[PDB]
Design a protein around this ligand. Structure first.
Ligand SMILES: CCCCCCCCCCCCCCCCCC(=O)OC[C@H](COP(=O)([O-])OCC(O)COP(=O)([O-])OC[C@@H](COC(=O)CCCCCCCCCCCCCCCCC)OC(=O)CCCCCCCCCCCCCCCCC)OC(=O)CCCCCCCCCCCCCCCCC
Ligand SMILES: CCCCCCCCCCCCCCCCCC(=O)OC[C@H](COP(=O)([O-])OCC(O)COP(=O)([O-])OC[C@@H](COC(=O)CCCCCCCCCCCCCCCCC)OC(=O)CCCCCCCCCCCCCCCCC)OC(=O)CCCCCCCCCCCCCCCCC
Ligand SMILES: CCCCCCCCCCCCCCCCCC(=O)OC[C@H](COP(=O)([O-])OCC(O)COP(=O)([O-])OC[C@@H](COC(=O)CCCCCCCCCCCCCCCCC)OC(=O)CCCCCCCCCCCCCCCCC)OC(=O)CCCCCCCCCCCCCCCCC
Ligand SMILES: CC(C)=CCC/C(C)=C\CC/C(C)=C/CC/C(C)=C/CC/C(C)=C/CC/C(C)=C/CC/C(C)=C/CC/C(C)=C/CC/C(C)=C\CC1=C(C)C(=O)c2ccccc2C1=O
Ligand SMILES: CCCCCCCCCCCCCCCC(=O)O[C@H](COC(=O)CCCCCCC[C@@H](C)CCCCCCCCC)COP(=O)(O)O[C@H]1[C@H](O)[C@H](O)[C@H](O)[C@@H](O)[C@@H]1O
Ligand SMILES: CCCCCCCCCCCCCCCC(=O)O[C@H](COC(=O)CCCCCCC[C@@H](C)CCCCCCCCC)COP(=O)(O)O[C@H]1[C@H](O)[C@H](O)[C@H](O)[C@@H](O)[C@@H]1O
Ligand SMILES: CCCCCCCC/C=C\CCCCCCCC(=O)OC[C@H](COP(=O)(O)OCCN)OC(=O)CCCCCCCCCCCCCCC
Ligand code: HEM
Ligand code: HEM
Lengths: 52, 223, 535, 37, 52, 55, 139, 92, 203
């Protein structure tokens, strides 16, 4: 093929990845830090009560 | 009360002995001792939810409470019996007083707020920033008992306002001002938060200036 | 008989005076129809609204520090000692019908005035509307921007308020009194003595209703007269040269559209005065030296000065038995900022060497170094503006206040460099895109070649096409190029009936044919005028 | 690759169009030994 | 009967030819390269965490 | 629309529950959007006039 | 599109079997009856693949054998006018930035930054969609 | 097709014969396009010096000083790389 | 620029000739809708877990569903789907203005559905049940309000497509755009049928 089906969409996909990724990393700059709960992010530990 | 003390102890033993060690003594470098904190401190802190705290950071954030009013009272009674200290206000029936804490004078409450509270919180009780990751939170969520107990026990990096320093009448006036400023509708439109210069400048640049530039682009011709 | 009355009045005017020739010149004056040239008109219209609302406000404002207990209508401030300025500002807000709206639209007009001055400055700087001619126009415009900044500073400081009085105490008092040789002497002469001197607000009232606005009006008159008689510059285009103005005449089109734009701008300002709350002085208690809030910011136009104050790293010098506080650093910084802004066109001409009489603007991409420098300066200004807001940024966006302060400190030397490099390369790449469009035509949908599986984008040349497929590349002419067949005569003729129902085919065909004929006529007129000029 | 990935396309017959393109002699061989496994 | 090639291919390219492509990129090939570089940057960022 | 909004501005300004209302008082809601209504009517009127002129 | 449709048909068969068996073996032989989370997820992924496969089968029956589907199809057979593939565009990055400003507004519970991110997203999606339809400026 | 080509004669006045060339900046003749490399090198060096100098201040903190050191170090590294490459003729 | 290097009357055309080939835009839309089905599957899983863990009285005592207002809105959404399909037929034809009429009435009925859902939300909130108020309230609000957000997105798509048809001439590209917008609307109404049968009838 010459290009993907929706080549402006795949451009959006990359930028959604990049900016979506950055705001997740952004937890570090906050005084509290990034997410305490592991990658799995289990329910009770993730609610507002735990890891606020 | 005997059963209230027992319930407070049972909640304490399975909630906080890991960081406020059993016997209410504080765990070195995990939590302060609760001897002398009193029932008011427990009520404010647990009701605001800060105390089921799952991190040591710049500031303990607020969160949904982990205990209902009865359990809050049980924990407060347990801590008061162990240490002994300030007690949360209560009304005629026995429940934590909410409306009784609304001082009659609001001009006096506002003056006291500006002299003491606005120092860090805001002109009207919105939040404020502090040195290293700390911040004075918005007061619009706090209920009159929570405001009164916050003054009574300096929660964290907040000056502790004793009854001698701020007579309960002055604290009631401050509570009245806080609630009034929080529940009062913005005259003149949408108060963009409560901070004038910064939200006002952003709203200019985003609402007024994009409107003006878009209208100019409509009227004129690209070239 | 309105026609008879108009003819008789015209004859009377041309008999009493003889303005026929001058009026015809004004009506026939041609103005380019670029949208970016309305940015100055935005500032002018906001200034007019400011004047109109300021007259109304002066009809009700009382400048004085004379202490008074409110005893007004606003209950939350009753019996509290306050100045007459604050009391009458509260009276405007509450006990005068529409006074809150008038003061709110006044403050919103001030904010739009500053913002539109900034946007107009960006336009002129990036398009090079200051070199050889109009350099003095740029200079007086810079003076105008500075005057507008300080005018708003005195304006929102006029109602003696906790927030604005704290801002005054910081800037006007501390910075003034820290200046080494004459700092205290300037402070005492401005304030009639110590900081809370009983003449500060009356003096600012004079400065803000008469003195500074008078100078602003005079400089706006000079600015508009210079633009009028030094015919407005224009972007390069088909029939546009350095010795002509292509656009529309003043009378039929330019005047009507400028008036309509004024109407729409004042409508936006009124809508925002209504719907958005600006400066709730009633919330902001009366000024008292012992009281303060956490926000403590000035309007967005002085936010960069405040951010400079915050970020500068507490460097103080102590000569023999003296002190040189950190306020002097920010004062000198502001002095340098204003000096550089005022003297840029002369700095640019000294550096580059171009003193040629320039009447054709240049696209910001076509001048990579200047657009890079302007981007760097805008980045520094935004950094300072957000540094001033670091308190609320830290509060809402959970970032430690020290972290925000040091982010500003490091960025104010890192971010300008990053933005300079990025803007320089971005401008050069925009030039490269223009050149690729020139030499290959516009891009379109892909086609698979018949014999083999080649894929070709099936471009569309913008100029004469060689005997074979590839076209003769054109030469860049300083004007924008159409990078989408969208914007050319391609798929642009929807049924001209209506949104819900069609029109008769005869009417639709007549309309579309007439429109196509008009487009042909306009393009042919431009082409023939261009050929006549360049041949 | 050229923008749009291709100036040509070979005869696509199997899962190795480029191998067939570059080694035409193997084309018969790739079919003969295919099923032997 | 001989071809006039360069001694070496263009090393990097003229100033200002990539920055605007990245913003306006619609070629999957360039986007894939942006993915690889950006994704690998997060590998280094995420990998640095493991070292701590 | 510009003219109708100008008439709306006139009628609202002449007849609307303006004046401060202390707090939690009947009429506080009307007062809170008194000034917003002034601005809405005025801005909409002149903006519609300007849009008509531009069109 | 026979193979394209049959792939999703096979996936639908497998996911329907998995959903049915999970539902049965969780209604009986589980501690608390049907799990109601895995069951629903399996049922609606069966629905996902079923929708896709049904559309693909409809298209396969609606379209004659394409060169792509046809073995022994010459390159010249498919040679022709491929449709419009969007060239360079800077709207995707703006859409991503607007959605990121809405996302941070949701994370840090700022209704004002949610409201603006959503406005931002509407504006940028409008720009992307209208990019190749904004007729020439009419002055 | 509904577009007319543009003829432009802007008044020119350094003559661009030295500095940057059209092959590097296509619109070199149309505006200021060359910043002397010495200017940028000295600017980077002074920015690094300012970052280092901000370490001296009334802050008990130390991560601030380390961030300043890192940013100044990367700035100096970039300036040194650029200067070395241009000295050798853009090699390595 | 003699006539054009690309012999096309539309700067933007169908991404492939759909008569002999699949419509890429339609294929992508169908796949994405099949993914949104899994999003709503997650929401359904939340709701069904709450239902299972409820102690017999699934809608708590304070909450009481209002079929009087929930039946008209779902009927209106079905009518909107029918009118959207009629607009699709218009788009398949060259009927620009017929498509515009059908999609305008579809947008109006979808807005009516959104307003009815908001009215039911206000009534429910007044009568106790709330997101923080109860697990039933929260799962119900999450499901139905995320569907309402999807309906709002469909309304935005409708108005945006109508603006596109206004600004450019009708072509197979715009016909396909209308077709895919209608696919989204049909998916929205189908998930609404599922949510209605689950929340109200099945309970
Ligand atoms: C959950 C997150 C929601 C995600 C929704 C978007 C995902 C859809 C992607 C698959 C659809 C097919 C596709 O390829 O999209 C084409 C297109 C990609 O264009 P392309 O790659 O350049 O190729 C040309 C197209 O193929 C040529 O086709 P087209 O350009 O003509 O596309 C037609 C329809 C394409 O068909 C659709 O996409 C259906 C639209 C349904 C989405 C509705 C949002 C539901 C979520 C709300 C609850 C959360 O385009 C429209 O005219 C309608 C678009 C309306 C989008 C409204 C989104 C607003 C979100 C904010 C709502 C505020 C309420 C919450 C508070 O994608 C879009 O236009 C959607 C923009 C992405 C929005 C992300 C929001 C963050
Ligand atoms: C509140 C008021 C309502 C909010 C929605 C207004 C936006 C709709 C109009 C946008 C389209 C447009 O102006 O072109 C059509 C047409 C312009 O025709 P033209 O300029 O002679 O030729 C344009 C060429 O096709 C040249 O075509 P082009 O591809 O070079 O770009 C065309 C156009 C639009 O191209 C785009 O980039 C499309 C995306 C913008 C559409 C936004 C729709 C959704 C907005 C929701 C919230 C907005 C924030 O460029 C603009 O962005 C124009 C400024 C409008 C920006 C809207 C706010 C951001 O204008 C109209 O039909 C009426 C426009 C009246 C002026 C108002 C614009 C500014 C007011 C909105 C900002 C207020 C902020 C407070 C909230
Ligand atoms: C205040 C702020 C608000 C905005 C105001 C600023 C507006 C400025 C726009 C300028 C428009 C203008 O002056 O046009 C007038 C214009 C005068 O110039 P002209 O006719 O082209 O004469 C030949 C050129 O001036 C010959 O000039 P040139 O083209 O050879 O270039 C030489 C130029 C060199 O260029 C410059 O240096 C010009 C810039 C001047 C610098 C600063 C002067 C302005 C200071 C204003 C301060 C305001 C406070 O020097 C000047 O022309 C300076 C003229 C100064 C007038 C400035 C007006 C303000 O023509 C008219 O007088 C038309 C109006 C006729 C009025 C009579 C109507 C009927 C009479 C009824 C009376 C009562 C009825 C009862 C029965
Ligand atoms: C509660 C309360 C008090 C509420 C009110 C708030 C308050 C205090 C004040 C605001 C109230 C008012 C009075 C608002 C409206 C302000 C106002 C005058 C708006 C006019 C816009 C309007 C109604 C247009 C109607 C549509 C229409 C038919 C327009 C064509 C006819 C018109 C009106 C033409 C006006 C032309 C115009 C703007 C002239 C301005 C005169 C001035 C100062 C400069 C002229 C001028 C201009 C405009 C340039 O752009 C320019 C550019 C480059 C070089 C020189 C010049 C130059 O000299
Ligand atoms: C385009 C022109 C139109 C301008 C907008 C005009 C909107 C008019 C609204 C209607 C009339 C005025 C209502 C005034 C009643 C009112 O004030 O509205 C508050 C709401 O407030 C919020 O939360 C915000 C909710 C989100 C919606 C509004 C967002 C609009 C923003 C985006 C406009 C500015 C643009 C900025 C762009 C940003 C992007 C920059 C890149 C609601 O009460 P509440 O929510 O409880 O306020 C809390 C006290 O209670 C509590 O004590 C107190 O402590 C506080 O917590 C307080 O918030
Ligand atoms: C306009 C913005 C763009 C700026 C461009 C310039 C880019 C360079 C940024 C320089 C970053 C400098 C970070 C260091 C700063 C520093 O030195 O402060 C520290 C805090 O470190 C940190 O988090 C570092 C966070 C760095 C992240 C920077 C993120 C950049 C973002 C802002 C870029 C996005 C820009 C968005 C643009 C929007 C466009 C608008 C149109 C320590 O404070 P503290 O909290 O008191 O820590 C105590 C312990 O030390 C002590 O042991 C312990 O005992 C405790 O006491 C503890 O509190
Ligand atoms: C890739 C690098 C990777 C580096 C990764 C290291 C990450 C570990 C950092 C913190 C861990 C938590 C500890 C938290 C407590 C700190 C530890 C400590 O106590 O270390 C002794 C003193 C302060 O003594 P203090 O008692 O804190 O009191 C003081 C005043 N009262 O600092 C020192 O000499 C030693 C320095 C300690 C930390 C400095 C780190 C800052 C930034 C590094 C470079 C940024 C580069 C930017 C590039 C553009
Ligand atoms: C009160 C502030 C200002 C007002 C009322 C104002 C008004 C105007 C207007 C209406 C124009 C013609 C239209 C246009 O070029 O957009 C103009 C042009 C100009 N302005 Fe200003 N502007 C202001 C601020 C500034 C500033 C801060 C600078 C710097 C500046 C420098 C210039 C220059 C050099 C021109 C000539 C542009 C040209 O000839 O094309 N102005 N001004
Ligand atoms: C020339 C540009 C001007 C700017 C940028 C400006 C800016 C401002 C600002 C921001 C305020 C604060 C309003 C508030 O806080 O509610 C203000 C107040 C005021 N302005 Fe101006 N103004 C300008 C011109 C004028 C003029 C020409 C007059 C008189 C005709 C005037 C009279 C007043 C008065 C009396 C006040 C006090 C209103 C109050 O305290 O609420 N201003 N000005």
């Amino acid at each position: 093929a010459p290009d993907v089906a929706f080549p402006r969409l795949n451009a959006l996909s990359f930028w959604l990845f990049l900016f979506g990724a950055l705001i997740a990393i952004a937890g570090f700059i906050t005084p509290g830090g990034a997410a305490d709960f592991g990658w799995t992010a289990y329910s009770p530990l993730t609610d507002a009560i735990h890891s606020p | 009360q005997s059963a209230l003390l027992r319930t407070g102890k049972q909640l304490f033993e399975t909630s906080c002995v890991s960081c406020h060690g059993a016997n209410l003594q504080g765990v070195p470098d995990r939590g302060p001792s609760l001897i002398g904190t009193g029932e008011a401190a427990v009520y404010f802190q647990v009701s605001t939810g800060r105390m089921p705290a799952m991190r040591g950071e710049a500031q303990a954030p607020s969160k949904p409470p982990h205990f209902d009013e009865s359990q809050i009272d049980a924990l407060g009674a347990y801590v008061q019996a162990n240490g002994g200290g300030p007690t949360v206000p209560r009304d005629d029936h026995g429940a934590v007083a909410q409306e009784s804490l609304i001082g009659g004078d609001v001009a006096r409450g506002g003056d006291l707020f500006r002299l003491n509270c606005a120092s860090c919180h805001n002109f009207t009780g919105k939040g404020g920033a502090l040195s290293s990751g700390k911040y004075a939170p918005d007061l619009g969520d706090a209920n009159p008992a929570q405001i009164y107990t916050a003054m009574l026990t300096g929660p964290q990096n907040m000056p502790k306002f004793s009854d001698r320093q701020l007579t309960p009448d002055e604290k009631r006036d401050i509570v009245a001002y806080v609630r009034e400023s929080a529940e009062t509708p913005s005259y003149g439109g949408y108060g963009l938060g409560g901070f004038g210069p910064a939200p006002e400048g952003m709203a200019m640049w985003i609402i007024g200036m994009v409107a003006a530039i878009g209208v100019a682009m409509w009227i004129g011709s690209r070239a | 008989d309105f026609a008879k009355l108009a003819a008789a009045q015209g004859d009377a005017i041309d008999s009493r005076y003889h303005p026929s020739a001058a009026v015809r010149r004004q009506l026939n004056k041609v103005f380019p129809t670029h949208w970016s040239f309305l940015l100055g008109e935005i500032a002018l219209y906001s200034f007019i609204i400011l004047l109109l609302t300021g007259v109304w406000l002066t009809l009700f404002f009382d400048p004085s520090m004379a202490h008074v207990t409110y005893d007004g209508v606003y209950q939350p401030l009753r019996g509290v000692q306050m100045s007459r300025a604050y009391e009458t500002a509260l009276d405007i807000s509450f006990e005068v019908r529409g006074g809150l709206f008038v003061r709110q639209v006044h403050h919103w007009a001030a904010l739009m005035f500053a913002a539109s001055i900034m946007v107009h400055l960006a336009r002129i700087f990036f398009t090079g509307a200051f070199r050889r001619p109009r350099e003095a126009n740029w200079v007086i415009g810079s003076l105008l921007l500075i005057l507008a900044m300080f005018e708003g500073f005195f304006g929102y400081s006029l109602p003696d308020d906790l927030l604005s009085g704290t801002g005054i105490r910081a800037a006007l008092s501390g910075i003034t009194m820290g200046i080494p040789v004459i700092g205290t002497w300037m402070h005492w002469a401005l304030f009639g003595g110590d900081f809370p001197g009983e003449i500060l607000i009356p003096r600012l009232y004079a400065l803000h209703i008469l003195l500074i606005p008078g100078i602003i009006l005079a400089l706006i008159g000079a600015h508009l007269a210079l633009v009028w008689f030094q015919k407005h510059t224009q972007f390069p285009g088909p029939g546009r040269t350095e010795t002509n103005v292509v656009g529309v005449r003043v009378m039929p089109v330019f005047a009507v559209k400028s008036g309509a734009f004024f109407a729409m701008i004042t409508g936006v300002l009124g809508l925002m005065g209504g719907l958005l709350t600006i400066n709730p002085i009633w919330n902001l208690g009366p000024y008292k030296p012992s009281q303060v809030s956490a926000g403590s910011q000035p309007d967005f136009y002085m936010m960069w000065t405040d951010g400079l104050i915050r970020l500068w790293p507490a460097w103080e010098f102590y000569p023999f038995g003296h002190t040189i506080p950190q306020g002097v650093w920010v004062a000198v910084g502001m002095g340098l900022v204003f000096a550089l802004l005022i003297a840029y066109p002369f700095i640019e001409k000294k550096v580059t060497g171009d003193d040629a009489h320039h009447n054709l603007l240049q696209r910001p991409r076509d001048v990579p170094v200047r657009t890079a420098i302007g981007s760097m300066a805008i980045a520094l200004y935004l950094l300072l503006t957000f540094a001033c807001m670091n308190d609320i940024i830290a509060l809402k966006f959970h970032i430690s206040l020290n972290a925000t302060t040091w982010i500003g400190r490091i960025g104010m030397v890192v971010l300008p460099a990053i933005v300079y490099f990025v803007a320089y390369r971005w401008a050069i790449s925009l030039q490269r895109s223009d050149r690729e469009v020139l030499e290959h035509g516009v891009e379109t949908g892909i086609i698979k070649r018949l014999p083999h599986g080649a894929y070709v984008e099936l471009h569309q040349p913008l100029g004469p096409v060689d005997e074979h497929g590839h076209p003769i590349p054109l030469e860049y002419a300083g004007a924008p190029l159409p990078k989408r067949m969208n914007k050319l005569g391609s798929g642009g003729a929807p049924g001209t009936g209506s949104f819900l129902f069609p029109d008769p085919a005869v009417e639709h065909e007549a309309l579309t044919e007439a429109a196509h004929a008009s487009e042909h006529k306009s393009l042919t007129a431009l082409k023939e005028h261009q050929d006549r000029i360049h041949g | 690759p050229p923008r749009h990935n291709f100036t040509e396309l070979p005869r696509i017959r199997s899962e190795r169009p480029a191998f067939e393109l570059h080694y035409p002699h193997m084309v018969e061989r790739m079919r003969a030994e295919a099923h032997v496994g | 009967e001989l071809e006039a090639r360069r001694p070496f291919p263009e090393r990097m390219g003229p100033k200002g030819n990539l920055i605007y492509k990245l913003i306006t990129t619609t070629d999957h090939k360039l986007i894939g390269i942006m993915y690889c570089v950006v994704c690998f940057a997060f590998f280094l960022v995420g990998g640095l965490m493991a070292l701590f | 629309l510009g003219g109708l909004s100008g008439l709306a501005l006139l009628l609202v300004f002449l007849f609307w529950p303006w004046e401060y209302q202390p707090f939690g008082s009947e009429g506080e809601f009307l007062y809170s959007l008194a000034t917003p209504l002034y601005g809405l009517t005025f801005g909409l009127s002149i903006l519609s006039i300007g849009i008509g002129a531009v069109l | 599109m026979h193979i394209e449709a049959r792939l999703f048909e096979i996936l639908t068969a497998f996911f329907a079997l998995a959903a049915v068996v999970y539902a049965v073996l969780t209604a009986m032989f589980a501690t608390g009856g049907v799990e109601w989370a895995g069951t629903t997820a399996l049922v609606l992924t069966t629905g996902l693949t079923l929708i896709t496969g049904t559309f693909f089968r409809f298209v396969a029956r609606r379209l004659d054998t394409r060169p792509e589907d046809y073995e022994d199809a010459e390159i010249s057979d498919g040679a022709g006018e491929l449709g419009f593939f969007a060239p360079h565009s800077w709207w995707p990055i703006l859409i991503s930035l607007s959605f990121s400003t809405a996302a941070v507004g949701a994370a840090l519970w700022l209704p004002w930054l949610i409201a603006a991110g959503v406005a931002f997203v509407i504006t940028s999606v409008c720009g992307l969609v209208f990019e190749y339809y904004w007729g020439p400026e009419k002055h | 097709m509904s577009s007319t080509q543009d003829r432009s004669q802007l008044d020119p006045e350094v003559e661009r014969h030295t500095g940057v060339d059209v092959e590097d900046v296509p619109s070199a003749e149309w505006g200021w396009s060359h910043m002397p490399i010495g200017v940028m090198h000295i600017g980077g060096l002074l920015s690094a010096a300012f970052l280092l100098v901000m370490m001296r201040g009334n802050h008990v903190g130390h991560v601030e000083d380390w961030f300043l050191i890192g940013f100044a170090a990367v700035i100096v590294a970039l300036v040194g790389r650029n200067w070395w490459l241009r000295r050798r003729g853009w090699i390595r | 620029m003699t006539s054009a290097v690309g012999t096309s009357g539309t700067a933007i055309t169908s991404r492939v000739h759909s008569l002999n080939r699949p419509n890429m835009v339609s294929v992508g839309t169908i796949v994405w809708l099949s993914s949104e089905l899994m999003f709503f599957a997650g929401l359904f899983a939340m709701y069904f877990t709450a239902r299972a863990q409820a102690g017999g009285a699934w809608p708590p005592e304070p909450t009481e569903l209002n079929l009087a207002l929930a039946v008209p809105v779902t009927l209106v959404l079905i009518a909107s789907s029918f009118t959207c399909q009629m607009g699709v037929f218009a788009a398949e034809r060259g009927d620009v203005f017929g498509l515009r009429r059908w999609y305008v009435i579809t947008f109006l009925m979808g807005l009516f559905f959104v307003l009815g859902q908001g009215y039911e939300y206000i009534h429910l909130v007044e009568h106790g049940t709330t997101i923080p108020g109860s697990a039933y309230g929260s799962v119900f609000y999450l499901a139905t309000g995320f569907h309402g957000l999807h309906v709002i997105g469909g309304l935005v798509a409708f108005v945006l497509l109508l603006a596109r048809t206004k600004m450019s001439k009708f072509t197979p590209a715009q016909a396909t755009a209308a077709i895919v917008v209608s696919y989204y609307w049909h998916f929205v109404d189908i998930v609404w049928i599922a949510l209605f049968a689950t929340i109200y009838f099945v309970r």
